[PDB]
Amino acid sequence: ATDILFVGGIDETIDEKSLYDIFSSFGDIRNIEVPLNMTTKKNRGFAFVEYVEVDDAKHALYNMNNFELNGKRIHVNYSK
Numbered sequence: 001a002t003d004i005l006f007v008g009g010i011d012e013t014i015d016e017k018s019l020y021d022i023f024s025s026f027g028d029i030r031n032i033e034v035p036l037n038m039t040t041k042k043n044r045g046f047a048f049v050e051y052v053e054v055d056d057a058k059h060a061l062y063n064m065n066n067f068e069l070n071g072k073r074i075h076v077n078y079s080k
């Protein structure tokens with residue numbers, strides 16, 4: 001367990017704004033990274049969510065792994 005989550009399988013509509021409003025439910029977010037495709041201006045299918053608190057990351061990972069966002073099932077892993 002770490003305070004940084006690798007999030008995969010995100011729908012093309014998800015950006016930093018929408019992922020913050022989803023993942024901020026679990027606790028204080030230090031940083032969110034959703035790289036954009038410089039051609040489509042859409043995400044590349046993954047993000048990093050960093051919590052202040054490892055306990056918040058653990059709660060987020062339990063609750064969001066295999067959860068469905070906009071009709072797509074997401075993958076949540078500890079990063080590092």
Ligand SMILES: [Mg+2]
Nearest residue numbers: 003051052053
């Ligand atoms: Mg930290």
